[PDB]
Amino acid sequence: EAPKNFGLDVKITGESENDRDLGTAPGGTLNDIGIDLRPWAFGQWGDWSAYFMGQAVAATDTIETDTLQSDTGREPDKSYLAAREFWVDYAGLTAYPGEHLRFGRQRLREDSGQWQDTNIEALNWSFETTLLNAHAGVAQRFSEYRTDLDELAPEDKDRTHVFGDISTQWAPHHRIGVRIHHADDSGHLRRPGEEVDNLDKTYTGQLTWLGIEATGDAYNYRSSMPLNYWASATWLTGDRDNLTTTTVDDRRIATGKQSGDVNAFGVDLGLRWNIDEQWKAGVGYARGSGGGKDGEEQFQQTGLESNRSNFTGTRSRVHRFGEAFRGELSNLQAATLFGSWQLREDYDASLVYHKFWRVDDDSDIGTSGINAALQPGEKDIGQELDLVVTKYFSALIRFRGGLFKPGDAYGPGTDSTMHRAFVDFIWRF
């Protein structure tokens, strides 16, 4: 019971992925295994505490051993070292032990995973009581802290994140709240005539997300309520200066840039039936605006998101928009069916169906686990069936599977079916 100062996380991960590009580019296939050692240290002295977690990975190929990876001077190696988290924490600001201030590289996380779920350098203030939850923090990436990555993602470079939220429990297990997030770019874009690589930035933006959120045990997998729900509306405002480019002799040259106001809208609705103590089923609809006058309605998430939550009502967390498609709520429309089952804390299982549309036929969608160009004039992105099965021993064995059936929007020459699967075996000392 003595508060544990250190431990080690072991994970054997094998991943099957075929094919990310829908057979348009050479290779790009995964069918590889790896191990991921994560030692962690923790100290606590009254109101003060400190924590470090490192990461050692060795794999047969650049497989994904971390759902919070920065997606890829930016070519990762099959094996690498990494400092995932390092932070100091003070909790003596108030007598509420749910209140604390955390400084360093830390796990920023909100329940839906659509606003922030990542490890990033930040100073975050958390205030979590029964009646009132409030968070405030500032974050920015200065490095990946890994032996195989030299540079930041262009989007992370010189981007500062400020964010805050406040919510109350107006009814037992019913939460209403507001959430704000601001992303500011201090970087520069390539001047006209300049060669632009893959690590130059697409744009520089001053973006602000204004969110309403109503939840009723939306991500509480032990809900005593027969019905759980999540509902959120988010307004994205600000401006973007997008870099315009042109190709001269198989190399892209900067041609200028255009400024433009962003006035987008994002909605995510969900209802989960608690049929009995084991079986649960539910429905979701999430829409990210896209297109509009000069792209003004192109919604986009914060860049810190993971879009992974326990929306299926299980202890295991599932990607909100498919483990294969991994859609970002951007120019995106999603209808989601899911059934889930769980036996105490020994097992949980989830079967999730998705269908994806575009909002605008000439506008690309946000990030995804699919690297295939979209046909102009076509909304039908495709369908996806997911299956997550987990057995908890601390330790756990988990299969995450996504089967993506591309729609008409991907067109000729593309594979009729793409899958991404994982078998995660985790052990805690």
Ligand SMILES: CCCCCCCC/C=C\CCCCCCCC(=O)OC[C@H](O)CO
């Ligand atoms: C307890 C709830 C908290 C308060 C929340 C109240 C506001 C939303 C309530 C129901 C929305 C249900 C909408 C059902 C799904 C909509 C499907 C849809 O709209 O897709 C068509 C699209 O708009 C293009 O045609």
Ligand SMILES: CCCCCCCCCCCC[N+](C)(C)[O-]
């Ligand atoms: C190889 C350098 C990093 C490894 C640091 C040590 C790993 C953590 C050791 C804790 C082992 C867990 N336990 C409970 C058995 O002590």
Ligand SMILES: CCCCCCCCCCCC[N+](C)(C)[O-]
């Ligand atoms: C969902 C199951 C995950 C499949 C894991 C398969 C591991 C096979 C590892 C063999 C590595 C050989 N090679 C050339 C592919 O790196």
Ligand code: NA
């Ligand atoms: Na406290």
